[PDB]
Amino acid sequence: SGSAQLPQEEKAKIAEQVEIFHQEKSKLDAEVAKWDDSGNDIIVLAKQMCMIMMEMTDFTRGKGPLKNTSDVINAAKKIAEAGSRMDKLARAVADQCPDSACKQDLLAYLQRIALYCHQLNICSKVKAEVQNLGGELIVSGLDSATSLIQAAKNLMNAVVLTVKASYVASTKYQKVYGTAAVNSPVVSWKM
Amino acid sequence: GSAQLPQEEKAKIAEQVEIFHQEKSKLDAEVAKWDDSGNDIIVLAKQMCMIMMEMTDFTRGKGPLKNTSDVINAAKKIAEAGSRMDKLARAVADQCPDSACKQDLLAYLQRIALYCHQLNICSKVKAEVQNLGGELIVSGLDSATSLIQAAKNLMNAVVLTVKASYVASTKYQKVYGTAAVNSPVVSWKM
């Protein structure tokens, strides 16, 4: 077989990066716990994106339904689709919002999501090459999964702050126009 | 964030490089005999030899190729040359009045087309990561050896074709004399 395992240093580097990712997913479960799902697709989408980023982390330690690079490339494209639908929703929430400090906070978090979705797309290549460098034949791109996790941790972080900022933007819309406002709030926040 | 090949696989490369140097020496031999000029078959044979040296050296940490894309480009150059060589020996084959020889040269000319193709395919030297048996493993580390093998097979067919081209010109002259109305397409001077 022309196959070998990743070197222990990189395996440990992978593992320590997946715990960092689990802390941020903890935060996401905490935040979404509080809220009923019906009438809130921001919450549903955040859960979907977390579900997939879970397949992607599992991949890097040897578990989950992701088997080859094109699986990982596929996962990243789903996350980006779900993020794009989150952007549309949250954007609409920001347009109802009358408090500009919170309108602008929400819109800024949407930039982070677009950015980290992009970087997740790039990193999902987990590309590996043989290279003739420095007088030796070497394999490079062994950290390609370490960079994949750090993209997911960053995206996971931005999603949490985006859900929080969508809720704040919502309370300010109701604060100003009331729960009988002629136009209903874009998403509902119940328990 | 990089690593060197397993010794298990480094060893398997150096040994397939050895079989390659062997076949290269047969070519180096046969080419010292002759004189470049008026013989583009010889010239093309050496061009194919140098690029293949570039390709084997890559697998040993040496030479100019650094990327897969360099290896792929080398294999493209090699097939370009093999194509220019096929044109030349094809003409030499048409001249051959003997048919046991015309056939041989056309046969080796088809082994070249074959191995140029297999070299092209192998020059990708692709490496994957995948999730297999609860592990993160790198695959495709045996790519270098398939590349050398294809180089060696190509090398051999070049030696066969250079020799068979000499012999096919020899038989063109035994029959139509060193005063033949049409010169031999290739000239063989020591």
Author numbering:
A (entry chain A): 670 to 860
B (entry chain B): 671 to 860
Pull verbatim passages from the article behind this deposition.
The structure of α-catenin (100 kDa) consists of three distinct domains. The C-terminal actin-binding domain (ABD) (28 kDa), which is connected to the rest by a flexible P-linker region28 (2 kDa), directly binds to F-actin, and closely resembles the vinculin ABD (vin-ABD).
We observed a nearly two-fold increase in the cosedimented amount of either ABD-H1 or ABD-Δα1 compared to ABD-WT. To examine the structural details of αcat-ABD with enhanced F-actin binding, we determined crystal structures of αNcat-ABD-H1. The dimer interface involves L807N of the βH, which mimics M673N of α1-helix interacting with the hydrophobic patch in the αNcat-ABD-WT structure. In addition, we performed chemical shift (CS)-based Rosetta comparative modeling (CM)48 to show that V796N of αNcat-ABD-WT remained in the cryptic state, whereas αNcat-ABD-H1 displayed a large conformational change that exposed V796N on the surface, resembling V796 in the crystal structure of αEcat-ABD-WT. Our αNcat-ABD-H1 crystal structures revealed an unexpected ABD homodimerization, which can facilitate F-actin bundling in vitro. It involves the βH motif forming an extensive dimer interface with the hydrophobic patch uncovered by α1-helix unfolding.
